[PDB]
Ligand binder design. Structure first.
Ligand SMILES: Cc1nc2ccccc2c(-c2ccc3c(c2)CCCO3)c1[C@H](OC(C)(C)C)C(=O)O
Ligand SMILES: Cc1nc2ccccc2c(-c2ccc3c(c2)CCCO3)c1[C@H](OC(C)(C)C)C(=O)O
Ligand SMILES: [Mg+2]
Ligand SMILES: [Mg+2]
Lengths: 131, 131
């Protein structure tokens, strides 16, 4: 179903990477964050919700969504309640960038553009079809 | 044409807001950045290019794209070479958030979801149709 996303954090090089997966297509977005915090999670959700029609969000760590900040983002935005593949791509491209965050965006790009349609095409098709 | 984006920075409260507009649909993405720098512009482009099929980028300040960092992002990603409306929405929502960056994501959301279809729907339709 088109309005469902999963959100989790992973760790790499002593930093945190927030990873959202659009479950039906396999499309991802990701950001490197200072801290695994309610505030970064909330902020990220607001950005996500402005781009795609986000209806529900799931996570593998339910305590992620406990803060007042997250609940306030989900309320305002109307929302209700690849780790290893991505780390694989990141490791393939890692020597070509100085900052981890650059390598992560490189790996998101590679992941979303790779064919079997690509995840980036699937999301847009799934969402356009649902309009 | 579906692969064309415009990118510019504006200023507000002594901060910089990077604003990308998908020209055919009127869809926007935006981020608050510390400095108007080549590095932030490059990083932003990499993120943008991983989400949408970005073919060409325009700007109102051509010197924006002069750095080695920007040229390197555009090379790697395969890329070639609302200010007032957004500031209007930001001013409408500004008292409801503590940080400017929150208000900016609120205004992006409001802008992309507002009907005459919404910009968020137009982009996905335009892009799906082009696949
Ligand atoms: C600092 C901060 N503190 C809070 C304390 C508890 C109440 C929620 C918040 C939110 C938040 C605020 C507004 C908001 C959304 C989430 C959702 C959108 C409508 O308004 C923020 C915001 O900052 C973060 C997003 C970084 C957490 C803010 O800038 O105001
Ligand atoms: C610090 C930095 N310095 C440079 C000096 C000149 C050469 C380009 C860069 C780039 C850049 C790097 C790789 C890259 C793209 C842009 C495009 C993608 C393929 O690799 C970066 C990157 O950092 C920023 C993105 C913040 C500028 C980096 O992390 O390596
Ligand atoms: Mg997690
Ligand atoms: Mg500018």
């Amino acid at each position: 179903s088109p309005g469902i996303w999963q959100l989790d954090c992973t760790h790499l090089e002593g930093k945190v990477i927030l990873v959202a997966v659009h479950v039906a297509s396999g499309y991802i977005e990701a950001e490197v964050i200072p801290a695994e915090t309610g505030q970064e999670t909330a902020y990220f959700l607001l950005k996500l919700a402005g781009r795609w029609p986000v209806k529900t969000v799931h996570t593998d760590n339910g305590s992620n969504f406990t803060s007042t900040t997250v609940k306030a983002a989900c309320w305002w935005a109307g929302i209700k309640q690849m780790n290893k593949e991505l780390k694989k791509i990141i490791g393939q491209v890692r020597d070509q960038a100085e900052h981890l965050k650059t390598a992560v965006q490189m790996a998101v790009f590679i992941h979303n553009k790779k064919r079997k349609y690509s995840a980036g095409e699937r999301i847009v098709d799934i969402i356009a079809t649902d309009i």
